[PDB]
Ligand binder design. Structure first.
Ligand SMILES: Nc1ncnc2c1ncn2[C@@H]1O[C@H](COP(=O)(O)OP(=O)(O)O)[C@@H](O)[C@H]1O
Lengths: 52, 182
């Protein structure tokens, strides 16, 4: 802005930025699989005792 | 000794064991030695690995099973002792040698060496105070109640015709062959 006033070869009424418009897995449930979860803390403390 | 006497049904293919009064041997599992076949890696893999019984029949394809009672004669003596310890264990006897009386059975035409070695076990490793090594054919006569009978066993590595007289066979008229279904 002050430099815009300084030099003569400077145009005015310039919205310098012009942008466009702006607006705003499934097989874990598969029937044939025997999908298992673990809770590793429990089984870990369980098998943890296996001093092998 | 004032305890229930142990009865040892020395079956060639299927060995058995039990006590007095009963009609079926208290604990039954055949005669074999199931050595392992792999190497433990995961914590959960059992140890000792020369397993008998549930683990044997269970993991047949994982245990190199062998047979000590070859020709009706045990060859894995020490291992058979441990199989008796397996019987002595919580599984079958839950007791000691020194506690219960024991009764060993035998086939005809047996070498003395086997009987001697067995006695070494029975009174040195095991320490039974009431024990004797009996026969098997006369025991089948006790079962039948007969007197002058011919007993024909049918095992895996033993076959003998025992012409008995009142439970006392002629120890000469008896024939014995050490081969069967094996
Ligand atoms: N139902 C059956 N049919 C045919 N053979 C059998 C049967 N049951 C057991 N056997 C045979 O009998 C054997 C059992 O050995 P066993 O008779 O205990 O030795 P022993 O004659 O010293 O008692 C097995 O090895 C098997 O081959």
């Amino acid at each position: 802005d002050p430099k815009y006033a300084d030099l003569p070869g400077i145009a005015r009424n310039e919205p310098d930025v012009y942008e466009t418009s702006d607006l705003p897995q499934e097989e874990l449930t598969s029937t044939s699989v025997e999908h298992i979860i673990v809770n590793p803390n429990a089984a870990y403390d369980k098998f943890k005792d296996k001093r092998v | 000794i004032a305890n229930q006497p142990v009865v040892i049904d020395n079956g060639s293919g299927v060995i058995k064991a039990g006590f007095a009064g009963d009609q079926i041997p208290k604990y039954c599992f055949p005669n074999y030695v199931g050595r392992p076949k792999h190497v433990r890696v995961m914590a959960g893999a059992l140890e000792g690995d020369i397993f008998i019984g549930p683990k044997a029949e269970e993991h047949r394809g994982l245990l190199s099973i062998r047979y000590p009672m070859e020709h009706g004669i045990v060859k894995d003596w020490n291992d058979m002792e441990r199989i008796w310890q397996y019987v002595y264990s919580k599984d079958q006897l839950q007791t000691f040698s020194e506690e219960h009386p024991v009764l060993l059975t035998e086939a005809p035409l047996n070498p003395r060496k086997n009987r001697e070695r067995a006695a070494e076990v029975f009174f040195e490793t095991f320490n039974v105070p009431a024990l004797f090594i009996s026969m098997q054919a006369v025991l089948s006569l006790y079962a039948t109640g007969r007197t002058t009978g011919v007993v024909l066993d049918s095992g895996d590595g033993v076959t003998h015709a025992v012409p008995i007289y009142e439970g006392f066979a002629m120890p000469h008229s008896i024939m014995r062959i050490d081969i069967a279904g094996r």
